[PDB]
Amino acid sequence: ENLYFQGDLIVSMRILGKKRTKTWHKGTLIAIQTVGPGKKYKVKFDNKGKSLLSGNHIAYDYHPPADKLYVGSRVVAKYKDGNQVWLYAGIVAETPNVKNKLRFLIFFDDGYASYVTQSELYPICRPLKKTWEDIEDISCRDFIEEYVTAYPNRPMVLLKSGQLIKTEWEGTWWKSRVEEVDGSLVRILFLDDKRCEWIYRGSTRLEPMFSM
Numbered sequence: 001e002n003l004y005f006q007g008d009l010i011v012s013m014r015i016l017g018k019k020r021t022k023t024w025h026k027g028t029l030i031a032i033q034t035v036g037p038g039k040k041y042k043v044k045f046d047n048k049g050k051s052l053l054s055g056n057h058i059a060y061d062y063h064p065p066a067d068k069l070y071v072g073s074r075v076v077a078k079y080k081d082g083n084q085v086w087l088y089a090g091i092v093a094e095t096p097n098v099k100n101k102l103r104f105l106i107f108f109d110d111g112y113a114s115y116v117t118q119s120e121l122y123p124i125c126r127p128l129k130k131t132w133e134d135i136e137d138i139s140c141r142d143f144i145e146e147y148v149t150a151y152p153n154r155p156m157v158l159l160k161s162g163q164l165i166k167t168e169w170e171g172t173w174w175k176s177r178v179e180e181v182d183g184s185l186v187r188i189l190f191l192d193d194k195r196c197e198w199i200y201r202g203s204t205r206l207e208p209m210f211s212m
């Protein structure tokens with residue numbers, strides 16, 4: 001069937017859609033198609049390109065209320081790489097508290113982690129019941145399942161600025177230095193190339209966690 005309304009969705013609404021690049025982009029919902037219990041959502045992107053998407057591959061063009069975000073919520077979040085802004089899918093790992101300066105911790109589908117504000121989040125429209133089940137990277141998927149279902153039990157390493165450890169990157173270990181701690185993240189400086197990364201303190205990419 002061709003629908004105009006489906007739950008809280010309405011044809012003609014502004015929406016975010018996931019492209020083949022894995023980045024998300026503004027568009028308009030132009031059709032809703034059902035095949036039995038299955039539902040697909042046709043999006044016309046602002047560049048006039050069209051794609052037929054599953055409901056976990058569209059997100060609302062508004063920010064979720066705080067009381068609708070939980071550990072395990074499926075979101076699109078802003079990631080600023082340099083002066084470029086991308087919208088990328090992830091999982092809420094932490095909700096605002098004193099220790100994180102009232103921010104949301106996001107674990108992105110590509111393994112990166114960041115603290116963001118509510119204004120940097122968009123809810124995915126039709127997430128899977130087990131929200132991690134559409135994470136393509138199996139390693140990341142398994143990590144998320146374990147994290148979300150064990151929460152609030154979260155093994156983490158205790159580090160401070162100046163400590164020297166090895167940190168994993170693309171399957172090898174690198175000499176590194178702890179630059180900064182911010183809540184559940186540590187900023188690691190890779191000594192070989194002097195590039196840095198915020199890494200979750202429970203990541204086995206950190207030597208002490210790997211060795212624990």
Ligand SMILES: */C(=C\C(=O)Nc1ccc2nc(NCCCCCN(C)C)nc(NCCCCCCN(C)C)c2c1)CN(C)C
Nearest residue numbers: 079081082088108110112169174190192193194195196197
């Ligand atoms: C460190 C500063 C510094 O290095 N800053 C910095 C700026 C931008 C960076 N961008 C990226 N991008 C990678 C892709 C991200 C995709 C995110 N998704 C869309 C959600 N990565 C940066 N760093 C990652 C770590 C690289 C380590 C390389 C290791 N090497 C030995 C091979 C990144 C960093 C502090 N200064 C030096 C004082």
